[PDB]
Design a protein around this nucleic acid. Structure first.
Ligand SMILES: O=P(O)(O)OC[C@H]1O[C@H](O)[C@H](O)[C@@H](O)[C@@H]1O
Ligand SMILES: [Mg+2]
Ligand SMILES: [Mg+2]
Ligand SMILES: [Mg+2]
Ligand SMILES: [Mg+2]
Length: 90
RNA sequence: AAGCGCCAGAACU
RNA sequence: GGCACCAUUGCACUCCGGUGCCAGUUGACGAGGUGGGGUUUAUCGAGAUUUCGGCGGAUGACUCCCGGUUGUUCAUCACAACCGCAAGCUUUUACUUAAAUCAUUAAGGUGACUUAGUGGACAAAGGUGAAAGUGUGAUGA
């Protein structure tokens, strides 16, 4: 179902952790207030992100508008997160 | 300101 | 930490697949010490993940040569042990700021770590002064 956090994958792996967190705060700021973007570069989490919006409504507009968007030469793939992130739980 | 300086191994990022 | 390649299309709150090539970082805490030449693996303790491993210095040690001191006062040659603006040996005696580690808390840095402050201590060698003992002979004098 719908969620506060959108799971983004198919992102370019060659890009550093910190500059990516700012590169997709540059785009997803349009849809609403972003709390924290979580990005790793490990074998598991290589080329995927978890952008956390304040409101769910913003995450839906983000999924609708940014689906298939070419970002670092690669079209983004956005799904809703399977579970709630441990910052919305509070 | 001379147990002082440097950094090729090693170790850690 | 960073580029190239290999492999990965995937739900997470102390980092975290692999090799290669770079890059960065750590890599001695104070005390002490220089007549000249040779020789050599260069003094003292503190700490305890590398203060390890490598290279460079270096005031060490010995050994000779040079120059001295002391050997009861001032002089020459021996000899003896010393010393390199100090100087025979023994017996005793104050001065001789340790600094890091430790603990802590700010600053910078992506991070490894770095700078600095604060708290409190704890050395050895050395050296510099008391004092009692004591150490030549010849030659002149
Ligand atoms: O300590 P090393 O890396 O062996 O270096 C050699 C010398 O280093 C320093 O100079 C020390 O004061 C000497 O005591 C030591 O002989
Ligand atoms: Mg030092
Ligand atoms: Mg010193
Ligand atoms: Mg060394
Ligand atoms: Mg050496």
């Amino acid at each position: 179902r719908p969620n506060h956090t959108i799971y983004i994958n198919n992102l370019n792996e060659k890009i550093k952790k910190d500059e990516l967190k700012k590169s997709l705060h540059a785009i997803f700021s349009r849809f609403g207030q972003i709390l924290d973007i979580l990005v790793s570069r490990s074998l598991k989490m290589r080329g995927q992100a978890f952008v956390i919006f304040k409101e769910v409504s913003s995450a839906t507009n983000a999924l609708r508008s940014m689906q298939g968007f070419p970002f670092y030469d690669k079209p983004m793939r956005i799904q809703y997160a399977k579970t709630d992130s441990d910052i919305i739980a509070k």
